[PDB]
Amino acid sequence: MSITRLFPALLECFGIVLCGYIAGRANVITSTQAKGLGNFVSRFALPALLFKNMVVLNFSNVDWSFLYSILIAKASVFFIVCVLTLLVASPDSRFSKAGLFPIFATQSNDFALGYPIVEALYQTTYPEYLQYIYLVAPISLMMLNPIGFIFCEIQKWKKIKIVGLGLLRVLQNPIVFMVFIGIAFNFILDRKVPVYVENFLDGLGNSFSGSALFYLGLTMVGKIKRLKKSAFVVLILLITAKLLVLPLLCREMVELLDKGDSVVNHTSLSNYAFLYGVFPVAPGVAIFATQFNMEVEIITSGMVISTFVSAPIMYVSAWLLTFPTMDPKPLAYAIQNVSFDISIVSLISLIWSLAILLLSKKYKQLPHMLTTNLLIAQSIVCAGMMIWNFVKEKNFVGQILVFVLLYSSLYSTYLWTGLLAISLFLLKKRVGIIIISGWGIPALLVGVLLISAFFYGKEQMITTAVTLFCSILIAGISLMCMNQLTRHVLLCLLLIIGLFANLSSCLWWLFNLYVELQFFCAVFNFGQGFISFGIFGLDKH
Template identity: 65%
Template structure:
């Protein structure tokens, strides 16, 4: 056409004459905004009145993210007329974004605390340069420029992915550098971090769909094939209404407040976005067009550049910026330390478990009575809506799984990560964290908020870079409280949308809890499950077992110079000596002090042939069976006055006798078990018992044929450990070797020790050998503190009772955490790899049933800072969710919600 040209936009041939058309159509802006907010209002009403269920809302979010937006991107990339693109506009916008990005990044590095400045710099810089391009930007631009410049909408589909590939990798690299620095993972080079980030960004679904669309543009000649076009048009045209309606759903119950302390960050970032961006975009375009003969046609494009700069920032981004005024905590939790468990590569669905209940409508949550009163404050949490809502999120996982598989087919990345932020004024439940333990998907529900302390330092996941696309999370309201890193690291499924699909659940929607899905199970341990575990003292007669028991427990069990002085087992509790416990008691000066205890059993001596009943052997072996670990006592001292049942002292021979008796007893036990299983599983055809039969055959081969103890084999899998724990064989029990020396030999540390150590290393590698002297310990125990110190200095030796007690406790796979306050300092015994709710259940079952969060301090941090308040100020007081694995020595304050009691009839 003369004076104009055809532009193909959204499947339509539109005549475009820039010289005669008006700059923009302001008259169409108000109807467009009315249409947008009308649809949003409809979604809000539907969600608020329960017309839309949680499952239906989630399905809508999945449809928008997995179908509508990908189709919209694909169609516009195929139909894009590259010849008509004014590239100076793109460069001006990108240069403006780079300037703002760099400014925010540098300022953050200058003013942020050293411990978290890299992560903050990367995240804040990303936030200050993002725009709500698709959800709200598209209808505004379309309304203003449809009649004059219909091609302007195409710039939205170019700026977004280019910005994503240009700026976001820098921010994500800074986040990864923060993790790398705080985790001290120097085995991973910085170059490797950069390459991983770039790979993840290139695999981002928005970039992927743009690339596919551009390739298709050249393959199809700028037109989508007719049949494919009809299908794609149907999906793409549904995006606008569906996305806006879904935005309304996400707004239900999300009206909150931004506190004064968090408002500073929000104001700074909004200023950078709304003031600098539009001015820079406009000025850069005019600068690039200076001297260009065609620049006279770019007046409206200059105005458009200014308009693009003021496009609203994603409200969810603003909320994150307002809440993220705390120290960035990053680390790793796959090995149980937190996070970050090594909270590394993550895959799966993301589900939101958020509560927006109001303080005035619910009672206070309970807390551990021994907590220091300095915590203060009343913690608000609703039992009817909030606690039930915590469990409800899993009921919709099946819908999500299908969408994730589909997203994978579309080229979505499957590794994501996220971490929690703080939520002002009220307790809020955040989105769940997803952790992968050796390719096993799990869900981590992170619950956090503390009303009395302004600083909150949640652990962050290992991978922070995953998928912060340009506007996928841009439709949340400014008061939507969610996990901050969920904005960055959602799966490929949700990186495709202009929403945050995991945010649609509303606090008034209740669904029955789904069993399972409480995150990764800890690795199984061989042995009885529980905390009231016992360790038995086992050995030949007259090797010093009862003497050791008396010294250890400070009791007066019979210890005589004849075999079988002990018939019935003696049992006692031994407090675990711990400087940490003593420090807490000295600091708090509590009314009650309760340390952890080791349960020790003195078992009568075994003799050769005990498995066949010699010397009351069957009874004594049954006493060993009731124990969970073994102190294997062997005699290495010469004393003519003390009888040795074998005639002479030979500790290696004595060890072999005890080992063989335990193995022979297991051999006797294995035979009938296999015979019974063979009768039912093999001849009877019981398929359920066939795996157990196969495992028992493997155990028989190891114990009977190869004549080895069960614990010697370190490659038992989970199923095999289940069978071992069913029968609790004697040879599966952990064993610590105690070598009882004379006082003279103990001081010299020479006699027999080398031979014993060589035997243990050859037959029971990894087992602990501890030399001690019953005579020395007895004498040492009766001395005063001054005499003990003088005697030890003169003889250059120390008591090893503390070492024996601690290692015996560790052999039982036990550890403990502390609750500390002016009322009580107490060590609570738990199994290793116990999660926070189960640890809380040790205090009271209601703590586990109504678990909200665990506020955790490391003892080393508490001691270093000098007080709980100082630890909070230093960012070392963390709030952990239900999948936090408690570590030995943690100081914990539990928050819980009292479970609803059944009504009396």
């Protein structure tokens, strides 16, 4: 698999999303102006891309068992979120919710984000996998979206006309009708686009990729709203459905339903099914939700958060999934290469977070003063990982020096999660010691340890586990004794869940998969800056 192409591909696609976000947030493009790009993207560039690919599509080469299995995974997530919503939501909104929540959990950003990422990963090895984006996404719309429209019409009402309106909203969608038209013209034209119409469709289709990622960025500006507690739990559960339950079900359904002869091809097919699940929610769900003014804050916020969170989940998942197809030496180089990429994006995000914290002078205010110590520590671990990738072969004293930098800063990030939750507790109840304890104690622990992850082996993971455990207890006890500050609590919560993943992974290593557990530790250790950027790098400072 060309898994090394994934970080370039993600950086491209999410960098274009970042360009849209920068442009819309800097008011280079206002929200009214952004509709022009959206109408271009959705009504010219996408239908042209659909039509071209659908007319060219060699249906006899389509693996219908793959389609079936992705589609059954989506249909099962639809039923699950639908019946769970109907059981759990209040009668006055359960039918609107049971329409849009399952469409959220199943409809997927396959064209703007999926296709560049699948083209990157698979055009060299498995170019037929690019077909299944164009198959699955529109067939998925045709099957699943009318049910949610039917549920919205049923909320409005509370039979043939309700069903007809559902199906008509689906047929009215340019994805659905340009795929029907492209299938019809696949049979008319016999899989050749006329050359004159071909490079017309090329021009429009080629323009889709960048303009759609950029428009997605523009749509993301300011859509993360301050949700109610219940709405936030619902948001988490819907994004878990999209980014964890659906791709697991996709991989499971492929492994149940595909019977292809080659075990290598089956493995790649179910790995593909997983990545196909991990694509974020389609912006079309939020367009529907805003247009019919239904559940807008959950669905818009969740579309934006799904987009941002799908990037690390895609990278981390795709690498995890290729570790069974790797051998321990290139596997070690792979996880240092992964960690170098994660530390680059983290360091860039952390430099930006630090610039904001400093130039806003928020670094002078509690809790942000201590948060700036956490962001300094996270910056030193991302510096330290890039430095280690160079120093890992070199002479012993350089390795020790960079190790002292890296583990003092890393253990410091753990201590600082604890000390941030203690800062919030001390702010809830009616700094020099906290800065010395946030750095000096975790720096001194490196001396205890001297007296990358297995250079000092069992002791290394022991000190690491103990530091993570102390951080979790410090933070859990201080958050419960407590039970802007909300954003700090959410950063601390995400970091505490990460520290728990990290603690359990280090413990499970200590009880034993090594390189996979080390990679998930490294993902937190060096990518935690991405979390800190998500919450404090994008605020209105």
